[PDB]
């Protein structure tokens, strides 16, 4: 619908080329590792208290 219905000089074609090879930024976690560390610390404290109990 944009090859056979756009009578302009390659603008659709260069748009499709620029889009086929776009690197859209995938966001990184940067927050799950520290809550995993916090879960480890909390499990440590809880097991200590449970041995006391």
């Amino acid at each position: 619908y944009y090859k056979a219905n756009v009578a302009k000089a390659g603008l659709v074609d260069d748009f499709e080329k620029k889009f086929n090879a776009l690197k859209v930024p995938v966001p990184e976690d940067k927050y799950t590792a520290q809550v995993d560390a916090e879960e480890k610390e909390d499990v440590k404290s809880c097991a200590e208290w449970v041995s006391l109990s």
Partner: protein, 51 residues
């Protein structure tokens, strides 16, 4: 009155002092009333979980 014959007065005084000040008191000391067996079902020095 035989109560006025002061010759037998020690015989009546010496055992009394043993009976009133030693023997009856040693038998009252062995008469003890322990405090009631009141059992507190509310005694728990607890604390919130580790958080």
């Amino acid at each position: 009155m035989p109560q006025l014959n002061t010759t037998v007065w020690p015989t009546m005084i010496t055992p009394m002092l043993l009976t009133l000040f030693l023997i009856t008191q040693l038998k009252m000391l062995n008469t003890n009333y322990h405090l009631p067996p009141s059992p507190k079902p509310m005694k728990m020095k607890n604390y919130n979980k580790p958080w």
